[PDB]
Design a protein around this ligand. Structure first.
Ligand SMILES: [Cl-]
Ligand SMILES: [Cl-]
Ligand code: NA
Ligand code: NA
Length: 129
């Protein structure tokens, strides 16, 4: 599923991401835009052989099991394919674990390089929330 901007904001808010660990909703919508273009089916292979999955591009070396990343942890205890569903629950629950591990949203490279320090509130402007 490819989400609309306000549609995704509403879904993330219902799942408890607004101000989760101090990150306002616009941060999460901005990260999703540049990680996946709002597409739940997005996948990208990394140089080390791991793969990133879903709307928030969660990596198989640490967070999910895809059966082809040797020596990986499955810290969210989920198959990586569950992160591609039109239902974002599994991606949101795993993202909550990631953002709480010490480095905040800096775990997402696209957030650091394209959202951090910008007017992220613009990503939810005009939405009925
Ligand atoms: Cl915001
Ligand atoms: Cl980047
Ligand atoms: Na929308
Ligand atoms: Na893994």
């Amino acid at each position: 599923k490819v989400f609309g901007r306000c549609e995704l904001a509403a879904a993330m808010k219902r799942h408890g991401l607004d101000n989760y660990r101090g990150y306002s909703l616009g941060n999460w919508v901005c990260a999703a835009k540049f990680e996946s273009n709002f597409n739940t089916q997005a996948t990208n292979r990394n140089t080390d052989g791991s793969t990133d999955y879903g709307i928030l591009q969660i990596n198989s070396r640490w967070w999910c099991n895809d059966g082809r990343t040797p020596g990986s942890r499955n810290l969210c205890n989920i198959p990586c394919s569950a992160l591609l569903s039109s239902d974002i629950t599994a991606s949101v629950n795993c993202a909550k674990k990631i953002v709480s591990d010490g480095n905040g949203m800096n775990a997402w490279v696209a957030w650091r390089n394209r959202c951090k320090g910008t007017d992220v509130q613009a990503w939810i402007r005009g939405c009925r929330l």
